[PDB]
Write a protein that binds this ligand. Structure first.
Ligand SMILES: COc1ccc(NC(=O)CN)cc1
Length: 164
């Protein structure tokens, strides 16, 4: 009944070298229960590697943490990412000739703030080619999208992947 642990983790980059397991935990526990929280360190010197990870009890807690960005942890703005090809644009395929901008917008706007929707048309005829690109203002939207098993838009079962 628990979501897979991999989907509950956040890799936190750009840490202050002074951040510890304890201070990273105290920060990120504001958005959920942490089942794990570790700062990566050198095995010999114990000096921070500048990144670490936190594991929440649920995916909704991961979402809450991501929605609370930017995170300033021990004085430094850090870079959380879900468990990286960091892009803001998706390819959406399988939408056929009847899918319009509003179909894509109404669905994808619940993943993130949309900046561009490009419904692809044939260079020669202008007919729709059956695929589109959606650009968001931030990569987490795409990360949430591509881990779903299924996307249904305008009644079509769509293929969605990271784009460039
Ligand atoms: C920034 O854009 C969005 C960010 C988060 C959500 N929803 C959730 O996080 C729901 N748990 C939707 C849009």
């Amino acid at each position: 009944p628990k979501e897979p642990e991999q989907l509950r983790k956040l890799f936190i980059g750009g840490l202050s070298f002074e951040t510890t397991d304890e201070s990273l935990r105290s920060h990120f526990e504001q958005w959920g229960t942490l089942t794990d929280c570790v700062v990566m360190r050198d095995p010999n010197t114990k000096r921070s590697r500048g990144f670490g990870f936190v594991t929440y009890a649920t995916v909704e807690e991961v979402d809450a943490a991501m929605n609370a960005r930017p995170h300033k942890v021990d004085g430094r703005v850090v870079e959380p990412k879900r468990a990286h090809l960091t892009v803001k644009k998706i390819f959406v395929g399988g939408i056929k000739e009847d899918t319009e901008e509003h179909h894509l917008r109404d669905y994808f706007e619940q993943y993130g703030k949309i900046e561009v929707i490009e419904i692809m048309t044939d260079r020669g005829s202008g007919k729709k080619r059956g695929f589109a690109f959606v650009t968001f203002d931030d990569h987490d939207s795409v990360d949430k999208i591509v881990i779903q098993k299924y996307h249904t838009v305008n009644g079509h079962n769509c293929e969605v992947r990271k784009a460039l």
